[PDB]
């Protein structure tokens, strides 16, 4: 381990991607992180997220850039504090189950896997965690999905062979 303090102040993203957070190069070096590393982010009350880390030359050394989706998963606001640590060797998922949030799919017609999930996950090797809510663009409107279960649990890589389940009743917004 690097032995160094691993708390960072939450800052906004420049490129919106649900799976990425960004640090300065000095901070990456302090924490022995490489670009594309899987990292585990922690907030309070056991809230967690798995992301990939990238290096951004405009990010302040004591901050972490993360989008609104990741911030909501961690239950933080801009300016709140999280921790970041290595999460090596995240296993490839056998299967995951996601369900849409009801108010994001009300009235929609069309196959949610083809329009939303397949292009989102295809050949992207996204890390994901049980309990995540993630926003996907497609069609006419953006859809939010909750990760109901993963196998392995609670997190995995959504790899080419990972089976994607999305049958069931849409979930109420919490």
């Amino acid at each position: 381990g690097s032995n160094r303090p691993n708390r960072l102040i939450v800052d906004e993203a420049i490129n919106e991607d649900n799976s990425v957070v960004s640090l300065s190069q000095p901070k990456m070096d302090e924490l022995q992180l490489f670009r594309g590393d899987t990292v585990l982010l922690k907030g309070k009350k056991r809230r967690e997220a798995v992301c990939i880390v990238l290096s951004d030359d405009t990010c302040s050394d004591e901050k972490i850039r993360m989008n609104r989706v990741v911030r909501n998963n961690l239950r933080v606001r801009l300016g709140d504090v999280i921790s970041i640590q290595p999460c090596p060797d995240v296993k490839y998922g056998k299967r995951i189950h996601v369900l849409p949030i009801d108010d994001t799919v009300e009235g929609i017609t069309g196959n949610l896997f083809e329009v939303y999930l397949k292009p989102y996950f295809l050949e992207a090797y996204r890390p994901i965690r049980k309990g995540d809510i993630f926003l996907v663009r497609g069609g006419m409107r953006a859809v939010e999905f909750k990760v109901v279960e993963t196998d392995p649990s609670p997190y995995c890589i959504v790899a080419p062979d990972t089976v994607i389940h999305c049958e069931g009743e849409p979930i109420k917004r919490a």
Binding site: H97, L99, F113, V148, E149, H165, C166
Partner: peptide
């Protein structure tokens, strides 16, 4: 719904 009900979808 229960978890992993059905055949799922392949990428």
């Amino acid at each position: 719904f229960r978890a992993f009900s059905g055949s799922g979808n392949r990428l």
